[PDB]
Amino acid sequence: ATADPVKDYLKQIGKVPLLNAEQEVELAKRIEAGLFAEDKLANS
DNA sequence: CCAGATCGTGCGACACACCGGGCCAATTGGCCGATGCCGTCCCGCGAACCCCTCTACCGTGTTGAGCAGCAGCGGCCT
Secondary structure (H helix, E strand, O other): OOOOHHHHHHHHHOOOOOOOHHHHHHHHHHHHHHHHHHHHHHOO
């Protein structure tokens, strides 16, 4: 808690590092597969 | 002295006083009935009016003064 919240948010967002193209593609594939599995679970 | 103003009195006219008759003028004022133009409304289409949606070279950091409470520290006490 500080009188300035912009600095707090800025310093908070930087903890997570960046990502590369292959990582992005792998994450997208994970999202797709997870949602399709969720739909399959929705099936009875 | 005696003669006109004032008034008494008299005769007439007479402008209406009555209270009652017998008709009339003017002037209606309603809408009667018939005819006609405007208000309202129900679409009809179209101009605009507002809302929602999407674009893939990429790109990764904003004074002074007065009064009171809290944090750090010196120094007993165990």
